[PDB]
Design a protein that fits this description.
Blueprint (H helix, E strand, L loop, with lengths): L11 E6 L12 E5 L3 E4 L5 E3 L7 E2 L4 E3 L7 H16 L1 E2 L6 E5 L4 E5 L6
Antiparallel strand pairs: 1-2, 1-9, 2-3, 3-4, 4-6, 5-7, 8-9
C-alpha cells in the first residue's frame, strides 16, 4: 500500500503524460513533497497545496498557482489537469519506484529520479 512516509522525502519527475512524454531542456515538470504530506510542483504556472495520504487518495486542502506561460501549450494546459486531479482526489498508485496517477481527468506517470541512484 502507498504510505505517506515513502513520499515526504522522495521527489518525482513527470516522465509521461497520458497523451505523450515531456521534454523541458533542464527544467521538467517535476514535483516534490514534504512534512504534513504537503506538495510543491511546477506543471507550468507553478502549484502548491496541503496534500494528504491515508488510503491512496491525494487531495489538496488548498491549491494555489500563478499566471505564467511556457512557450509550449502542453505544459500550460497540464496545470489544469493537476488542479482537477488534486481537487477530486488523485488516485495514487506509487509502485516500487514509479508514481502512477489515474483520476477522472487522466493518468500521469512520474519517476523516482530522487537524485539517489
Amino acid at each position: 500500500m502507498v504510505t505517506p512516509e515513502q513520499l515526504q522525502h522522495h521527489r518525482f519527475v513527470l516522465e509521461s503524460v497520458n497523451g505523450k512524454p515531456v521534454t523541458s531542456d533542464k527544467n521538467p515538470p517535476e514535483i516534490s513533497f514534504g512534512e504534513k504530506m504537503m506538495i510543491s510542483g511546477s506543471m507550468c504556472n507553478r502549484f502548491s497545496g496541503e496534500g494528504k495520504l491515508s488510503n491512496g487518495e491525494l487531495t489538496a486542502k488548498g491549491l494555489a498557482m500563478t499566471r505564467m506561460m511556457c512557450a509550449n501549450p502542453q505544459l500550460n494546459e497540464l496545470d489544469n489537469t493537476i488542479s482537477e486531479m488534486l481537487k477530486e482526489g488523485a488516485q495514487v498508485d506509487l509502485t516500487a519506484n514509479q508514481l502512477t496517477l489515474a483520476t477522472a481527468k487522466q493518468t500521469l506517470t512520474y519517476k523516482l529520479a530522487d537524485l539517489m541512484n
